[PDB]
Swiss-Prot record, chains A, B:
Multi-functional protein which regulates not only caspases and apoptosis, but also modulates inflammatory signaling and immunity, copper homeostasis, mitogenic kinase signaling, cell proliferation, as well as cell invasion and metastasis. Acts as a direct caspase inhibitor. Directly bind to the active site pocket of CASP3 and CASP7 and obstructs substrate entry. Inactivates CASP9 by keeping it in a monomeric, inactive state. Expressed in colonic crypts (at protein level). Ubiquitous, except peripheral blood leukocytes. Belongs to the IAP family. It comes from the Eukaryota. The chain holds residues 22 to 99 of 497 of the full protein. This is E3 ubiquitin-protein ligase XIAP. It is found in: Cytoplasm; Nucleus. The gene is XIAP. It is linked to Lymphoproliferative syndrome, X-linked, 2: A rare immunodeficiency characterized by extreme susceptibility to infection with Epstein-Barr virus (EBV). Symptoms include severe or fatal mononucleosis, acquired hypogammaglobulinemia, pancytopenia and malignant lymphoma.
Amino acid sequence: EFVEEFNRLKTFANFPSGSPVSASTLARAGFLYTGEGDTVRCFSCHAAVDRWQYGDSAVGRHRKVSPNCRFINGFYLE
Amino acid sequence: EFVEEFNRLKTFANFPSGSPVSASTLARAGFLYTGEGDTVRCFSCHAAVDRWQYGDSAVGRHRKVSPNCRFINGFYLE
Ligand SMILES: [Zn+2]
Ligand SMILES: [Zn+2]
């Protein structure tokens, strides 16, 4: 279901507009919005990432927190 | 957008598995998959490279076709 980026993007309703990282960027990096604050969680490795700050890379933070995530490693590539 | 290696890697869905060079290696060398055959194109210098053969170096072929590419010269280094 969440293999599709659009389905991930739909979980971002009410995502804080004041966040330095956008909902589209986070969805692209494999994240789903948990609904609380700025906490997102990867559909694949289940790692959660929060406390986003200016200059952050959605993919960069994702790799840092979960270096062996299959999604980031291209496991779902058609 | 494509400055991020992962975004380049995502363009490789359906990239021929029989190719002597892998999608990850090509993405690392700054290439995006054009979707046709084994033709990839650099996000930075726009040079396209195809006809990959055993023993080929993704970065090597990239330099040969586009010696002044900013990406290969490290222009995007943080
Ligand atoms: Zn993950
Ligand atoms: Zn180039």
